[PDB]
Design an enzyme around this catalytic site. Structure first.
Site, PDB file in Angstrom:
ATOM      1  N   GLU A 124       0.823  -1.308   0.061  1.00 19.72           N
ATOM      2  CA  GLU A 124       0.047  -0.176   0.057  1.00 19.72           C
ATOM      3  C   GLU A 124       0.840   1.223  -0.115  1.00 19.72           C
ATOM      4  OE1 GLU A 124      -3.047   0.367   3.021  1.00 19.72           O
ATOM      5  OE2 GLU A 124      -3.753   2.059   2.351  1.00 19.72           O
ATOM      6  N   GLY A 265       3.553   2.759  10.928  1.00 16.31           N
ATOM      7  CA  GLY A 265       3.164   1.842  12.396  1.00 16.31           C
ATOM      8  C   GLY A 265       2.808   0.467  11.684  1.00 16.31           C
ATOM      9  N   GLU A 302      -5.218  -2.687  12.863  1.00 17.89           N
ATOM     10  CA  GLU A 302      -5.008  -3.645  11.676  1.00 17.89           C
ATOM     11  C   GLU A 302      -5.912  -4.572  11.545  1.00 17.89           C
ATOM     12  OE1 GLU A 302      -3.265  -1.996   9.545  1.00 17.89           O
ATOM     13  OE2 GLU A 302      -2.112  -0.892  11.070  1.00 17.89           O
TER      14      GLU A 302
HETATM   15  C1  LIG Z   1       0.002   0.960   6.104  1.00 15.99           C
HETATM   16  C2  LIG Z   1      -0.087   2.608   5.767  1.00 15.99           C
HETATM   17  C3  LIG Z   1      -0.134   2.568   4.060  1.00 15.99           C
HETATM   18  C4  LIG Z   1      -0.702   3.625   6.560  1.00 15.99           C
HETATM   19  C5  LIG Z   1      -1.250   3.344   8.063  1.00 15.99           C
HETATM   20  N1  LIG Z   1      -0.293   3.195   9.194  1.00 15.99           N
HETATM   21  C6  LIG Z   1       0.064   4.090   9.792  1.00 15.99           C
HETATM   22  O1  LIG Z   1       0.988   3.182  10.790  1.00 15.99           O
HETATM   23  N2  LIG Z   1      -0.127   5.334  10.114  1.00 15.99           N
HETATM   24  C7  LIG Z   1       0.657   5.817  11.413  1.00 15.99           C
HETATM   25  C8  LIG Z   1       1.713   6.476  11.113  1.00 15.99           C
HETATM   26  C9  LIG Z   1       2.146   7.382  10.344  1.00 15.99           C
HETATM   27  C10 LIG Z   1       3.417   8.114  10.172  1.00 15.99           C
HETATM   28  C11 LIG Z   1       4.521   7.530  10.982  1.00 15.99           C
HETATM   29  C12 LIG Z   1       4.326   6.576  11.897  1.00 15.99           C
HETATM   30 CL1  LIG Z   1       5.886   6.049  12.887  1.00 15.99          CL
HETATM   31  C13 LIG Z   1       3.120   5.991  11.945  1.00 15.99           C
HETATM   32  C14 LIG Z   1      -2.279   2.400   8.417  1.00 15.99           C
HETATM   33  O2  LIG Z   1      -3.691   2.815   8.212  1.00 15.99           O
HETATM   34  N3  LIG Z   1      -2.136   1.044   8.503  1.00 15.99           N
HETATM   35  O3  LIG Z   1      -3.522   0.244   8.503  1.00 15.99           O
HETATM   36 ZN   LIG Z   2      -5.160   1.687   8.610  1.00 11.35          ZN
END
Ligand SMILES: CC(C)C[C@H](NC(=O)NCc1cccc(Cl)c1)C(=O)NO
Ligand SMILES: [Zn+2]
Ligand SMILES: [Mg+2]
Ligand SMILES: [Mg+2]
Ligand SMILES: [Mg+2]
Length: 890
Positions: A124, A265, A302
């Site tokens: 993604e 994250g 998640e």
């Molecule tokens: C997988 C990614 C496409 C985006 C997203 N993840 C996410 O960890 N956003 C928070 C973030 C942002 C910036 C720095 C950090 Cl250290 C952490 C998410 O929604 N995971 O489900």
């Molecule tokens: Zn997410």
């Protein structure tokens, strides 16, 4: 410039039904063989077949076993593979490719890459095209059959999405494993991992269908013991989705995997969720308290995506908030339920009103569903996530629990196994709304402006009380400031949760109720209101807005003491602070600009200080809540109320205010710091990684907040208390001892001692880095230089880079030094980072977001650094787009 527009969405001329992959991992190359079983769609008009494919080395290309040749049947430019229409079949056909890629050198951590000794993917949003050719967009849904092969000794654990259907030996020390994922998915949900991984595991039995699910959490060997809290949080997450939403997991197995190098994250790959180690791994001897909350919320997030993102996915990327906003809402509900502390909601509000409100008044301002993008990655914003969560939470506030559940179930049922849009979600919530109001004329058309209109509304209040008629009225106005997205802003559907407090006895006068403001203004009248109340407004923070309460400080103190709603109490406190801050800021500003030899400061309200004492001395009041009351609003919150901000004046303002309160409450602070110790630092559950006492953790936060205040104040002999605190077994305590030692000659001994305690755990060393970076030190630039030379060096790990620099950027006095040297240092880091990791480079730009809010010298210094970075040769599209938008050029 390559701009995509939301209104231009068109379904593809092609369909991909099945993806059959062979991923052959070797030391210096990975070979990816791929068969797409494809078809022509009803939207097809004889167009060329164009696949996304970035940085791929082609070995072979065929259609239906006929070799296609460069310059004759296809072209490839390192970004798109075009197959000329004349050679594209007219019905069902097999497209085959084989490419070579190089995870060992992929420092960008998107596509297939190596993180220490693990091979892992991140697809993604547009990473899959870096693994193989695809029509790399979320509406191209297909079923996947995936074989991974590798050297057995080096990579004994092989994972991909879904059921492991076969394992085999291969000559020459190799082995393979084949996986079948029976659910239709977009490519951004593909994942693969290969590594020398250890695991803990459990079995979970689904509530209603009684399906047996095997749960595995994985890490490298060294940290296997730090896996158990994540596993327990996954069990919690599954039980919560069953209990609240009726939603059961839908494969026989679910794997979570920690990796050391990860841009964000974690990631919700079907059946194979991949985490930054800092959001999956913890142990009580080796992690700070905050890690436990972080792991709970990220594991939860998640998992919640398995329905909101996976089983119902996105039609296109403009719909991002549909999954992320809604998943963040589900995570926050889960987190509130698990923690049972009022500070969990407060902490979400705090983050929104500081970081997201800043963004929403910056030139990067966007609605939660944007109108255009260049680089997809620049949309993963606090607007899309956190404002999005608040928009998704308002549906629950409006509908209530049972009608919300009904609306959500309709959303899930209709769109299951398919793509969806924000209109589909609002449509489902609309059917629940129709039911609740008994009324088919009622609609949520107006509600859609929460998705399309950018900026933060301002909601203001005026009151009247007729004491003979026992009638109270609240007159409400809303306004959104026009911006680049909309020159005329329309009124929103704003739910305002309210109560009314009797100010002479502190009791509730009405049943809590939700006012529905749908116009620019409205007047809400209450009868049988026996005395003049004090209104308790936007309880729970019921809409994402600037609240102007038009209450006196005396009325705010009364809410702070007696109101039932933790947000309103906190907000009342916050407003008293902000009034004081803007008054003293103005006084200091006039003193500087007019060159005064003498002047006055307005003292801090003495009844507010008494209320703070009263709260703090209440042994039955919440310890987390107390830590919010003794801290001033965040700088990023403050900056939203000031133009042409002189950051050195704000620093003098906050220091005067803290000193005023200190000069009255320091003995109370000390006394509570000592008396909280036994319950705060009690070792019950210290050896149980399945259980966390979030209240006790809040006692530690309070004690650590008080010590900070006492340390800065130089309270007599506080140094002994800092020494003893450095010997606690809680890393939250001994790292706190380091940062509060910054005001003493002991800093450098605590530096060394906590270094030695931290250096053998990768994540704990990262926490130590952050603690050093945020130390309130005069010599902080020389300390960063020491971190760079001795510890960071040339690490390409995003956790290490962010830990050294980001906390320092929040040092108001130093980062914003009038020379611009702080601006220069972080720009250098950004430019260096951008050469190998464009996503992380743009994260590192975050301090520059407030540039046009500063005093004109600091504005000029920030803009200069930004234009310098824009001039760097081979600047990434990600960084260029960000900086062009931020500087009013795009
Ligand atoms: C997988 C990614 C496409 C985006 C997203 N993840 C996410 O960890 N956003 C928070 C973030 C942002 C910036 C720095 C950090 Cl250290 C952490 C998410 O929604 N995971 O489900
Ligand atoms: Zn997410
Ligand atoms: Mg390549
Ligand atoms: Mg969160
Ligand atoms: Mg490392």
């Amino acid at each position: 410039p390559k701009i995509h527009y939301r209104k231009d969405y068109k379904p593809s001329g092609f369909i991909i039904n099945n993806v059959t992959l062979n991923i052959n991992i070797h030391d210096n190359e990975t070979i990816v063989r791929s068969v797409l079983d494809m078809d022509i769609s009803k939207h097809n008009v004889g167009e060329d077949l164009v696949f996304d494919g970035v940085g791929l080395k082609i070995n072979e290309i065929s259609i239906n076993n006929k070799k296609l040749v460069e310059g004759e049947e296809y072209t490839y430019d390192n970004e798109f593979l075009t197959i000329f229409s004349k050679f594209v079949p007219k019905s069902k056909f097999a497209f085959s490719s084989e490419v070579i890629i190089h995870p060992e050198t992929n420092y960008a951590l998107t596509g297939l890459y190596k993180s220490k000794n693990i091979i892992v993917s991140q697809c993604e949003a547009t990473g899959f095209r870096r693994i193989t050719f695809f029509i790399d967009r979320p509406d191209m849904m297909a079923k996947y059959d995936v074989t991974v092969t590798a050297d057995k000794e080096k990579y004994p654990v092989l994972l991909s999405n879904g059921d492991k259907v076969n394992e085999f030996e291969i000559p020459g020390g190799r082995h393979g494993a084949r996986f079948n994922d029976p659910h239709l998915k977009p490519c951004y949900l593909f994942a693969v991992v290969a590594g020398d991984l250890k695991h803990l595991s459990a079995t979970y039995i689904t509530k209603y269908t009684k399906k047996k699910v095997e749960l595995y959490v994985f890490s490298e060997e060294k940290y296997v013991s730090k896996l158990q809290w994540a596993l327990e949080c996954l069990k919690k997450s599954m039980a919560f989705d069953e209990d609240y939403f009726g939603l059961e997991y839908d494969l026989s197995r679910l794997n979570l995997v920690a990796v050391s190098d990860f841009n964000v994250g974690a990631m919700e790959n079907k059946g194979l969720n991949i985490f930054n180690a800092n959001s999956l791994l913890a142990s009580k001897k080796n992690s700070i308290d905050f890690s436990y909350a972080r792991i709970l919320t990220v594991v939860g997030h998640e998992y919640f995506h398995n329905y909101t993102g996976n089983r119902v996915t996105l039609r296109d990327w403009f719909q991002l908030t549909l999954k992320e906003g809604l998943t963040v809402h589900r995570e926050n509900l889960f987190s509130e339920e698990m923690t049972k502390t009022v500070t969990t909601r407060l902490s979400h509000v705090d983050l929104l009103r500081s970081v997201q409100f800043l963004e929403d008044s910056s030139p990067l301002s966007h609605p939660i569903r944007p109108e255009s993008y260049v680089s997809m990655e620049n949309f993963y914003t606090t607007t899309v996530y956190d404002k999005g969560s608040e928009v998704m939470r308002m549906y629950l506030t409006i509908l209530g629990e049972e009608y919300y559940k009904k609306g959500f179930d309709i959303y899930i049922k209709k769109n299951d196994g398919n793509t969806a849009t924000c209109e589909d979600f609002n449509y489902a919530m609309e059917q629940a709304y129709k039911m609740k109001k008994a009324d088919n004329s009622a609609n949520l058309n107006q509600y859609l402006l929460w998705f399309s209109q950018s900026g933060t509304p301002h909601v203001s209040f005026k009151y009247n009380y007729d004491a003979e008629k026992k009638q109270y009225s609240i007159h409400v106005n809303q306004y959104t400031k026009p911006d680049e997205n909309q020159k005329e802003k329309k009124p929103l559907f704003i739910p305002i949760s309210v109560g009314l407090i009797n100010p002479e006895n502190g009791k509730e006068m009405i049943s809590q109720t939700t006012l529905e403001l749908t116009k620019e203004s409205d007047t809400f009248v209450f009868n049988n209101i026996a005395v003049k109340p004090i209104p308790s407004l936007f309880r729970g923070f019921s809409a994402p807005v600037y609240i102007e309460d038009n209450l006196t400080d005396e009325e705010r103190i009364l809410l702070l003491k007696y109101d039932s709603d933790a947000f309103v109490r906190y907000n009342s406190c916050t407003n008293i602070y902000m009034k004081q801050i803007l008054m003293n800021y103005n006084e200091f500003l006039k003193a500087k600009n007019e060159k005064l030899e003498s002047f006055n400061l307005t003292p801090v309200n003495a009844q507010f200080i008494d209320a703070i004492k009263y709260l703090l001395e209440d042994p039955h009041a919440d310890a987390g809540f107390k830590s919010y009351i003794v801290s001033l609003p965040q700088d990023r919150y403050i900056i939203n109320f000031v133009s042409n901000l002189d950051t050195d004046v704000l620093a003098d303002t906050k220091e005067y205010i803290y000193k005023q309160i200190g000069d009255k409450l320091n003995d109370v602070y000390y006394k509570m710091f000592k008396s909280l110790e036994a319950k705060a630092d009690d070792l019950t559950y210290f050896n149980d990684e399945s259980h966390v006492d979030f209240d006790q953790m809040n006692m530690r936060t309070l004690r650590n907040t008080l010590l900070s205040l006492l340390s800065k104040a130089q309270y007599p002999n506080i140094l002994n208390e800092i020494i003893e605190h450095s010997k606690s077994p809680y890393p939250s305590n001994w790292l706190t001892s380091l940062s509060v030692s910054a005001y003493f000659d002991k800093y450098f001994e605590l530096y060394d001692k906590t270094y030695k305690l931290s250096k053998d755990d990768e994540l704990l060393l990262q926490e130590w880095l952050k603690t050093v970076s945020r130390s309130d030190r005069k010599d902080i630039y020389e300390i960063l230089k020491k971190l760079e030379n001795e510890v960071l060096k040339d690490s390409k790990n995003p956790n290490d880079i962010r830990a050294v620099y980001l906390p320092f950027t929040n040092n108001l006095r130093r980062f914003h030094d009038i020379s611009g040297k702080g601006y220069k240092l972080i720009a250098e880091v950004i430019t260096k980072t951008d050469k190998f990791n464009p996503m992380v480079a743009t994260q590192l730009c975050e301090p520059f977001k407030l540039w046009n809010k500063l005093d004109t010298k600091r504005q000029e210094l920030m803009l200069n650094e930004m234009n310098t970075m824009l001039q760097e040769p081979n600047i990434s599209n990600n960084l260029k787009e960000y900086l062009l938008r931020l500087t009013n050029k795009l």
